Curated annotation (Swiss-Prot), chain A:
Belongs to the bacterial ribosomal protein bL27 family. Keywords: Ribonucleoprotein, Ribosomal protein. The keyword Phosphoprotein does not apply. It comes from Mycolicibacterium smegmatis (strain ATCC 700084 / mc(2)155) (Mycobacterium smegmatis). One of its GO terms (biological process) is translation. InterPro entries: Ribosomal_bL27 (IPR001684), Ribosomal_bL27_CS (IPR018261). One of its GO terms (cellular component) is cytosolic large ribosomal subunit. HAMAP family: Ribosomal_bL27. Pfam families: Ribosomal_L27. GO terms for molecular function: structural constituent of ribosome. This is Large ribosomal subunit protein bL27. The keyword Ribonucleoprotein applies.
From Swiss-Prot, chain B:
Binds 23S rRNA and is also seen to make contacts with the A and possibly P site tRNAs. One of its GO terms (biological process) is translation. InterPro entries: Ribosomal_uL16, Ribosomal_uL16_bact-type, Ribosomal_uL16_CS, Ribosomal_uL16_dom, Ribosomal_uL16_sf. SUPFAM superfamilies: Ribosomal protein L16p/L10e. The gene is rplP. This is Large ribosomal subunit protein uL16. Residues 1-13 have a biased composition (Basic residues). HAMAP family: Ribosomal_uL16.
Swiss-Prot record, chain D:
The gene is rpmG2. GO terms for cellular component: cytosolic large ribosomal subunit. Pfam families: Ribosomal_L33 (PF00471). Keywords: Ribonucleoprotein, Ribosomal protein. PANTHER family: 54S RIBOSOMAL PROTEIN L39, MITOCHONDRIAL, LARGE RIBOSOMAL SUBUNIT PROTEIN BL33M. It comes from Mycolicibacterium smegmatis (strain ATCC 700084 / mc(2)155). It comes from the Bacteria. This is Large ribosomal subunit protein bL33B. Belongs to the bacterial ribosomal protein bL33 family. Gene3D superfamilies: Ribosomal protein L33 (2.20.28.120). GO terms for molecular function: structural constituent of ribosome. GO terms for biological process: translation.
From Swiss-Prot, chain E:
Keywords: Ribonucleoprotein, Ribosomal protein, RNA-binding, rRNA-binding, tRNA-binding. This is Large ribosomal subunit protein uL5. GO terms for biological process: translation. GO terms for cellular component: ribonucleoprotein complex; ribosome. This is one of the proteins that bind and probably mediate the attachment of the 5S RNA into the large ribosomal subunit, where it forms part of the central protuberance. In the 70S ribosome it contacts protein S13 of the 30S subunit (bridge B1b), connecting the 2 subunits; this bridge is implicated in subunit movement. Contacts the P site tRNA; the 5S rRNA and some of its associated proteins might help stabilize positioning of ribosome-bound tRNAs. PANTHER family: 60S RIBOSOMAL PROTEIN L11-RELATED. Part of the 50S ribosomal subunit; part of the 5S rRNA/L5/L18/L25 subcomplex. Contacts the 5S rRNA and the P site tRNA. Forms a bridge to the 30S subunit in the 70S ribosome. Belongs to the universal ribosomal protein uL5 family. Coiled coil: none annotated.
Length: 79, 136, 126, 53, 182, 64
RNA sequence: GUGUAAGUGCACAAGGGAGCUUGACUGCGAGACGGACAUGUCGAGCAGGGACGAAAGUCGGGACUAGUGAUCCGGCACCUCU
RNA sequence: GUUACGGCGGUCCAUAGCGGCAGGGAAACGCCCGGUCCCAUCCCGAACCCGGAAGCUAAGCCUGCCAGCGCCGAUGAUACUACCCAUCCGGGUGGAAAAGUAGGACACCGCCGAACAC
């Protein structure tokens, strides 16, 4: 007379965190993710948990490189 | 009786009764069809009753197509039990039927007997329905 | 009405080369102050370039087709060596000291390696 | 967890003239215990340890 | 500075005859044998892991090259078969060694089979690759036929750049395989 | 092939003991598997192997 | 197919295979995520001393997420602290 | 500058693919000859590597052709929907698919090198 279900796992707060256009510093986290849904491009690095981060400051551009959505960083214009 | 041989998930939500048909709004394989007008869940036993109603009204020869199959279950739970403590087991199987959808298609020569048969099969179902010719 | 069946080894060797070259290329980069040294080999002769992959442009060039390089007599290896000399001179004229070395989808050793080692000897930083 | 004689067993990895116990948990149904091993100690440098429990 | 029998013969007569038969534009279209293949499925890997070594030794003595030991990539337990159990040996042959092997096979052993009426013309496939099989190794004088402890048969298959069975059979005829001439 | 040596490789003279239509050629058959009588059939001398039976002494498609 | 559940990914291989091998290191850490709080997660880059590689460069465990339990009280080795 | 050339790259990567037809080999791309030397096969100079240019453009590759296997793809309408009106029903302002259709398309672009030339 039991429901043997009921369990669940607390969240991990995944997804995009710095969308198109924004200004990001270095080492900042663009997206947390399990697999490489989004891949790195230029001035972008990968983590251990397939997190992404910035290697050079600038601003974002979610473009594709041969069918795969990438993330990039572009040079800000110095004031 | 109509049931599937196996479903992956044997406890499903209740189907939706919102919206009009997308397919089965056109007679396909016979000449004289049935078309729904309302929203409803139609079960196994209803369709059995209806096909028997038709075959006992033509009685010799003339074909009957059933464009529906009860591939979505529903869950009763045993009697006099307080609410809670889980989800009941599947007991009868429905097909959702949105308005515009076609259920049955006959192929018998004379329209008299055919229209009459379809009417006898309409009065075995919970829905308002109407009768269709393949024409425009 | 004679007709073949399937893959020739020329096709195999070609597409495998492209396969592993664009495997390797993941790690190699390009820039006008650190360009890529591509090599493109054949049985007879050889070709090389200095590439900027930021714009897919080219800064230097050389090959064992030019009569001045055919003026070598020695082995294929010696042709390759003099080629490395020429590209060192040309690169350091056009203003490049440091580079990487892309083996272009070929194995290191033999003509490729003797080229590159001659270049390392004659000044290029790799 | 506990201290049962688990398949993944043993510990301690001590150093020769290098007293910086580096630790690792490994099995023990396999044979070996007189070769390999290396790491950086104090004041010293990349040299060779034992697995000495 | 050397030439095997079948290869000298190949470059002398057989290319000419196939040209005069099939009338190719380029001679590059001429059919030519590439390699020869040998295999032995032990099959009792789960019952004798030592017949494998026996077969290795036999094929060594037979072909003059240490075989390859083919592992079982899948595990099908209705045969005891598990991932990595050695089931068979395999050898590739290319060049002068190949031509010498065909010379020996055609000239010593296949004229030593018991009541050899003929190898079929129907062991081909798609274009002309001849895949036959031997029950015993009691035939090669290469083998020390005193020491054998069991029959350990084998399976041979001969691959060629021929494009169809007609060209394959014609080439292998010119090279001297005893087909059943039919 | 390469070290992890294979069997040894030397020539051979397969002397036709049927009708004297002998063969002779390079082979991987030697110390491994050879017979005495280094009979030169050619400009050089190399082992010989009695051929108990062969093609021209084995009635078949190629022989009656 | 991916050691083990599922998903997200992996053929550009993270799948399969072979050679060396211990970075399954030490001293740190910009800036960030998530955030009641304590916990938790990644982290480029610098230094010694190394592996591999021809070099560029990668290596601060495992394709990623689970695989464990705060504080107190005791125990073992080392310290130029008392 | 230029031709039926080769090589390195790019496109928010099939408008670029697969298959069929014809056609080309000057220098180059190739295939091929052979394992003397570096080097290599979980066995095999098959591959990788080395030394050369007898032979052939048959194949790879490049060129044109075929919209056929695949892809791309609108306008307008519909579904759905935000907001508002509305005693159930339904409706108005804006947004707007998928599929389908008309069609498109046997790719385009950049750099160096050759050959060719004033």
């Amino acid at each position: 007379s039991s429901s043997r279900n009921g369990r669940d796992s607390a969240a991990q707060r995944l997804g995009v965190k710095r969308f198109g256009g924004q200004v990001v510093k270095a080492g900042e986290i663009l997206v947390r993710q399990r697999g490489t849904h989004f891949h790195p491009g230029v001035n972008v690095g990968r983590g251990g948990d397939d997190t992404l981060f910035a290697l050079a400051p600038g601003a974002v551009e979610f473009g594709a490189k041969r069918g795969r959505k990438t993330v990039n960083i572009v040079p800000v214009a110095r004031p | 009786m109509l049931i599937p041989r196996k479903v992956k998930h044997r406890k499903q939500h209740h189907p939706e009764q919102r919206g009009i048909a997308s397919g089965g709004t056109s007679v396909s394989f016979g000449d004289y069809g049935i078309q729904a007008l309302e929203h409803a869940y139609i079960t196994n036993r209803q369709i059995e009753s209806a096909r028997i109603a038709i075959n006992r009204h033509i009685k010799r020869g003339g074909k009957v197509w059933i464009n529906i199959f009860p591939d979505r279950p529903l869950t009763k739970k045993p009697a006099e039990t307080r609410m809670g403590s889980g989800k009941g087991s599947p007991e009868w199987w429905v097909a959702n039927v949105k308005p515009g959808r076609v259920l049955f298609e006959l192929s018998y020569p004379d329209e008299k007997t055919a229209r009459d048969a379809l009417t006898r099969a309409i009065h075995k179902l919970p829905i308002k329905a109407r009768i269709v010719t393949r024409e425009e | 009405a004679h007709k073949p069946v399937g893959q020739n080894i020329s096709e195999v060797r070609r597409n495998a080369r492209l396969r592993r070259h664009a495997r390797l290329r993941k790690k190699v980069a390009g820039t006008a102050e650190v360009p890529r040294l591509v090599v493109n080999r054949s049985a007879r002769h050889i070709h090389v370039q200095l590439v900027n992959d930021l714009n897919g442009t080219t800064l230097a060039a050389a090959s064992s087709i030019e009569a001045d390089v055919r003026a070598i007599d020695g082995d294929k290896k010696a042709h390759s060596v003099r080629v490395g000399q020429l590209i060192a001179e040309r690169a350091k004229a056009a203003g490049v000291e440091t580079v990487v070395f892309d083996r272009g989808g070929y194995t290191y050793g033999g003509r490729i390696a003797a080229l590159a080692d001659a270049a390392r000897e004659a000044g290029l930083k790799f | 967890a506990r201290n049962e004689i688990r398949p993944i067993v043993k510990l301690r990895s001590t150093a020769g003239t290098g007293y910086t116990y580096v630790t690792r948990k490994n099995r023990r149904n396999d044979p070996d215990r007189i070769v390999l091993r290396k790491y950086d100690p104090v004041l010293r440098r990349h040299v060779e340890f034992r697995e000495e429990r | 500075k050397a030439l095997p029998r079948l290869k000298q013969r190949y470059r002398e007569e057989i290319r000419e005859a196939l040209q005069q038969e099939f009338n190719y534009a380029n001679v590059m279209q001429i059919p030519g044998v590439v390699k020869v293949v040998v295999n032995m499925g032990v099959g009792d890997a789960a019952r004798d892991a030592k017949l494998i070594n026996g077969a290795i030794n036999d094929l060594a003595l037979i072909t003059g090259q240490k075989p390859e030991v083919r592992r079982a990539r899948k595990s099908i337990a209705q045969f005891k078969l598990r991932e990595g159990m050695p089931i068979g040996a395999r050898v590739t042959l290319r060049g002068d060694r190949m031509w010498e092997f065909l010379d020996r096979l055609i000239s010593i052993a296949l004229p030593r089979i018991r009541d050899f009426r003929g190898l079929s013309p129907k062991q081909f496939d798609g274009t002309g690759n001849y895949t036959f099989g031997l029950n015993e190794q009691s035939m090669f004088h290469e083998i020390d036929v005193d020491s054998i402890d069991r029959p350990r048969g084998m399976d041979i298959t001969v691959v060629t750049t021929a494009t169809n069975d007609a060209e394959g059979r014609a080439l292998l005829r010119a090279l001297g395989f005893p087909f059943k001439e039919n | 092939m390469k070290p992890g040596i294979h069997p040894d490789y030397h020539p051979v003279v397969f002397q036709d003991a049927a009708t004297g239509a002998q063969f002779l050629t390079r082979s991987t058959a030697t110390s491994t598997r050879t017979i005495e009588w280094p009979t030169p059939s050619g400009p050089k001398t190399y082992p010989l192997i009695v051929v108990d039976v062969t093609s021209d002494s084995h009635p078949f498609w190629t022989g009656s």
